[PDB]
Design an enzyme around this catalytic site. Sequence first.
Site, PDB file in Angstrom:
ATOM      1  N   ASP A  25     -15.162   1.195  -0.193  1.00 48.05           N
ATOM      2  CA  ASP A  25     -15.334  -0.250   0.003  1.00 48.05           C
ATOM      3  C   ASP A  25     -15.732  -0.653   1.421  1.00 48.05           C
ATOM      4  O   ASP A  25     -16.320  -1.720   1.627  1.00 48.05           O
ATOM      5  CB  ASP A  25     -14.041  -0.988  -0.353  1.00 48.05           C
ATOM      6  CG  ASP A  25     -13.609  -0.781  -1.793  1.00 48.05           C
ATOM      7  OD1 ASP A  25     -14.350  -0.174  -2.598  1.00 48.05           O
ATOM      8  OD2 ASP A  25     -12.493  -1.230  -2.126  1.00 48.05           O
ATOM      9  N   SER A  79      -4.923  -5.368  -8.140  1.00 50.16           N
ATOM     10  CA  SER A  79      -3.721  -6.150  -7.814  1.00 50.16           C
ATOM     11  C   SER A  79      -2.413  -5.404  -8.129  1.00 50.16           C
ATOM     12  O   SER A  79      -2.392  -4.168  -8.199  1.00 50.16           O
ATOM     13  CB  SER A  79      -3.768  -7.560  -8.432  1.00 50.16           C
ATOM     14  OG  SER A  79      -4.802  -8.335  -7.844  1.00 50.16           O
ATOM     15  N   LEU A  81       0.589  -3.410  -7.503  1.00 54.99           N
ATOM     16  CA  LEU A  81       0.889  -2.476  -6.421  1.00 54.99           C
ATOM     17  C   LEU A  81      -0.395  -2.218  -5.616  1.00 54.99           C
ATOM     18  O   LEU A  81      -1.371  -1.714  -6.158  1.00 54.99           O
ATOM     19  CB  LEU A  81       1.408  -1.164  -7.021  1.00 54.99           C
ATOM     20  CG  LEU A  81       2.397  -0.245  -6.297  1.00 54.99           C
ATOM     21  CD1 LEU A  81       2.550   1.058  -7.073  1.00 54.99           C
ATOM     22  CD2 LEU A  81       1.974   0.057  -4.889  1.00 54.99           C
ATOM     23  N   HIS A  84       1.607   2.032  -1.135  1.00 55.33           N
ATOM     24  CA  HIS A  84       3.016   2.326  -0.898  1.00 55.33           C
ATOM     25  C   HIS A  84       3.126   3.380   0.194  1.00 55.33           C
ATOM     26  O   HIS A  84       2.167   4.097   0.474  1.00 55.33           O
ATOM     27  CB  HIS A  84       3.714   2.802  -2.175  1.00 55.33           C
ATOM     28  CG  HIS A  84       3.422   4.225  -2.522  1.00 55.33           C
ATOM     29  ND1 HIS A  84       4.288   5.252  -2.218  1.00 55.33           N
ATOM     30  CD2 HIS A  84       2.354   4.796  -3.129  1.00 55.33           C
ATOM     31  CE1 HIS A  84       3.770   6.396  -2.631  1.00 55.33           C
ATOM     32  NE2 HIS A  84       2.597   6.147  -3.184  1.00 55.33           N
ATOM     33  N   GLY A  93       7.474  12.107   4.073  1.00 56.41           N
ATOM     34  CA  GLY A  93       7.998  11.042   4.923  1.00 56.41           C
ATOM     35  C   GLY A  93       6.922  10.428   5.799  1.00 56.41           C
ATOM     36  O   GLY A  93       6.144  11.143   6.432  1.00 56.41           O
ATOM     37  N   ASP A  95       4.173   9.063   5.004  1.00 53.38           N
ATOM     38  CA  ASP A  95       2.830   9.036   4.405  1.00 53.38           C
ATOM     39  C   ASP A  95       2.555   7.710   3.723  1.00 53.38           C
ATOM     40  O   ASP A  95       3.466   7.088   3.174  1.00 53.38           O
ATOM     41  CB  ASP A  95       2.634  10.167   3.398  1.00 53.38           C
ATOM     42  CG  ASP A  95       2.642  11.535   4.044  1.00 53.38           C
ATOM     43  OD1 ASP A  95       2.809  11.627   5.282  1.00 53.38           O
ATOM     44  OD2 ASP A  95       2.486  12.524   3.301  1.00 53.38           O
ATOM     45  N   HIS A 119       1.740  -3.734   6.877  1.00 54.33           N
ATOM     46  CA  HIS A 119       2.902  -3.767   5.996  1.00 54.33           C
ATOM     47  C   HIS A 119       3.360  -2.350   5.634  1.00 54.33           C
ATOM     48  O   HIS A 119       4.536  -2.023   5.800  1.00 54.33           O
ATOM     49  CB  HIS A 119       2.574  -4.587   4.735  1.00 54.33           C
ATOM     50  CG  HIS A 119       3.637  -4.555   3.675  1.00 54.33           C
ATOM     51  ND1 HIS A 119       4.497  -5.609   3.452  1.00 54.33           N
ATOM     52  CD2 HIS A 119       3.954  -3.611   2.758  1.00 54.33           C
ATOM     53  CE1 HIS A 119       5.308  -5.310   2.452  1.00 54.33           C
ATOM     54  NE2 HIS A 119       4.997  -4.103   2.012  1.00 54.33           N
ATOM     55  N   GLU A 120       2.432  -1.517   5.156  1.00 59.78           N
ATOM     56  CA  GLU A 120       2.776  -0.142   4.753  1.00 59.78           C
ATOM     57  C   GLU A 120       3.322   0.683   5.908  1.00 59.78           C
ATOM     58  O   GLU A 120       4.307   1.412   5.739  1.00 59.78           O
ATOM     59  CB  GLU A 120       1.598   0.583   4.091  1.00 59.78           C
ATOM     60  CG  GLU A 120       1.130  -0.022   2.764  1.00 59.78           C
ATOM     61  CD  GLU A 120       2.256  -0.263   1.771  1.00 59.78           C
ATOM     62  OE1 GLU A 120       3.190   0.570   1.680  1.00 59.78           O
ATOM     63  OE2 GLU A 120       2.204  -1.295   1.076  1.00 59.78           O
ATOM     64  N   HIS A 123       6.917   0.305   6.450  1.00 58.75           N
ATOM     65  CA  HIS A 123       7.682   1.228   5.613  1.00 58.75           C
ATOM     66  C   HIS A 123       7.715   2.621   6.233  1.00 58.75           C
ATOM     67  O   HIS A 123       8.776   3.238   6.322  1.00 58.75           O
ATOM     68  CB  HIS A 123       7.082   1.333   4.206  1.00 58.75           C
ATOM     69  CG  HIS A 123       7.207   0.086   3.385  1.00 58.75           C
ATOM     70  ND1 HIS A 123       8.393  -0.599   3.241  1.00 58.75           N
ATOM     71  CD2 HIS A 123       6.299  -0.571   2.622  1.00 58.75           C
ATOM     72  CE1 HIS A 123       8.209  -1.630   2.435  1.00 58.75           C
ATOM     73  NE2 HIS A 123       6.946  -1.638   2.049  1.00 58.75           N
TER      74      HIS A 123
HETATM   75  O1  LIG Z   1       1.251 -11.595   3.411  1.00 63.11           O
HETATM   76  C1  LIG Z   1       1.781 -11.305   4.482  1.00 63.11           C
HETATM   77  O2  LIG Z   1       2.896 -10.373   4.433  1.00 63.11           O
HETATM   78  C2  LIG Z   1       3.321  -9.784   3.197  1.00 63.11           C
HETATM   79  C3  LIG Z   1       2.476  -8.583   2.799  1.00 63.11           C
HETATM   80  C4  LIG Z   1       1.406  -8.146   3.582  1.00 63.11           C
HETATM   81  C5  LIG Z   1       0.652  -7.036   3.184  1.00 63.11           C
HETATM   82  C6  LIG Z   1       0.953  -6.359   2.001  1.00 63.11           C
HETATM   83  C7  LIG Z   1       2.020  -6.792   1.204  1.00 63.11           C
HETATM   84  C8  LIG Z   1       2.770  -7.902   1.611  1.00 63.11           C
HETATM   85  C9  LIG Z   1       1.309 -11.749   5.665  1.00 63.11           C
HETATM   86  C10 LIG Z   1       0.123 -12.381   5.751  1.00 63.11           C
HETATM   87  N1  LIG Z   1      -0.173 -12.712   7.042  1.00 63.11           N
HETATM   88  C11 LIG Z   1      -1.294 -13.351   7.425  1.00 63.11           C
HETATM   89  O3  LIG Z   1      -2.165 -13.698   6.591  1.00 63.11           O
HETATM   90  N2  LIG Z   1      -1.482 -13.625   8.797  1.00 63.11           N
HETATM   91  C12 LIG Z   1      -2.710 -14.302   9.243  1.00 63.11           C
HETATM   92  C13 LIG Z   1      -3.761 -13.230   9.502  1.00 63.11           C
HETATM   93  C14 LIG Z   1      -3.785 -12.038   8.761  1.00 63.11           C
HETATM   94  C15 LIG Z   1      -4.747 -11.059   9.002  1.00 63.11           C
HETATM   95  C16 LIG Z   1      -5.705 -11.263   9.995  1.00 63.11           C
HETATM   96  C17 LIG Z   1      -5.690 -12.443  10.739  1.00 63.11           C
HETATM   97  C18 LIG Z   1      -4.723 -13.424  10.496  1.00 63.11           C
HETATM   98  C19 LIG Z   1      -0.496 -13.225   9.732  1.00 63.11           C
HETATM   99  O4  LIG Z   1      -0.657 -13.469  10.952  1.00 63.11           O
HETATM  100  C20 LIG Z   1       0.653 -12.568   9.275  1.00 63.11           C
HETATM  101  C21 LIG Z   1       0.774 -12.321   7.901  1.00 63.11           C
HETATM  102  S1  LIG Z   1       2.085 -11.523   7.148  1.00 63.11           S
HETATM  103 CA   LIG Z   2      -3.010  -1.995  -7.674  1.00 62.68          CA
HETATM  104 CA   LIG Z   3       4.554  12.809   6.643  1.00 65.17          CA
HETATM  105 CA   LIG Z   4     -11.980   0.190  -4.107  1.00 58.81          CA
HETATM  106 ZN   LIG Z   5       1.492   7.690  -3.644  1.00 61.51          ZN
HETATM  107 ZN   LIG Z   6       5.992  -2.904   0.631  1.00 60.65          ZN
END
Ligand SMILES: O=C(OCc1ccccc1)c1cn2c(=O)n(Cc3ccccc3)c(=O)cc2s1
Ligand SMILES: [Ca+2]
Ligand SMILES: [Ca+2]
Ligand SMILES: [Ca+2]
Ligand SMILES: [Zn+2]
Ligand SMILES: [Zn+2]
Length: 167
Positions: A25, A79, A81, A84, A93, A95, A119-120, A123
Amino acid sequence: YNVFPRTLKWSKMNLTYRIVNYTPDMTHSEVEKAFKKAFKVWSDVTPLNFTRLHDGIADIMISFGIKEHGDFYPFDGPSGLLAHAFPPGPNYGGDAHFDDDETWTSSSKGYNLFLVAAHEFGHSLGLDHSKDPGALMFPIYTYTGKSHFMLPDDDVQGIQSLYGPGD
Ligand SMILES: O=C(OCc1ccccc1)c1cn2c(=O)n(Cc3ccccc3)c(=O)cc2s1
Ligand SMILES: [Ca+2]
Ligand SMILES: [Ca+2]
Ligand SMILES: [Ca+2]
Ligand SMILES: [Zn+2]
Ligand SMILES: [Zn+2]
């Protein structure tokens, strides 16, 4: 003698990552940039440092896959998941696996790779999900439309509870 550490955290500050394969992508460069920025989110607020390796075993092995891909956390198509990651530890661990049934972007379309990676990697470093809908570690992806990324206070508190601040 040695007893097991009580906390799932890295006991070294200089960590390595490796991009094992790439999504179709985005360009190699865009993917690399996304992950580098995602790691910076955490290095900015802790003493942790991150170095990319081009071969061998890194602490955080990053890959893209779909459905069953070699663990107990199969993906589920578009969408749901999105990705992870495993808690700090040897082998699996740390990864991080990304679902290539998502449309990965460096924009506001599809799913922003940098954002999901941030986010990942949370974790990967020892954070579980937050109950605060505004936190990066909240389970559900909610892009805000805002221009510049800011790490929410909940996530700063969480990560510093494990590593303290950079200085
Ligand atoms: O949705 C969130 O957290 C939960 C989550 C995230 C990823 C996967 C699963 C779950 C978050 C979303 N955001 C944001 O859209 N923005 C603004 C922004 C983002 C990117 C680039 C520029 C400005 C932030 O500043 C902070 C957060 S936190
Ligand atoms: Ca998915
Ligand atoms: Ca590892
Ligand atoms: Ca793809
Ligand atoms: Zn996996
Ligand atoms: Zn998560």
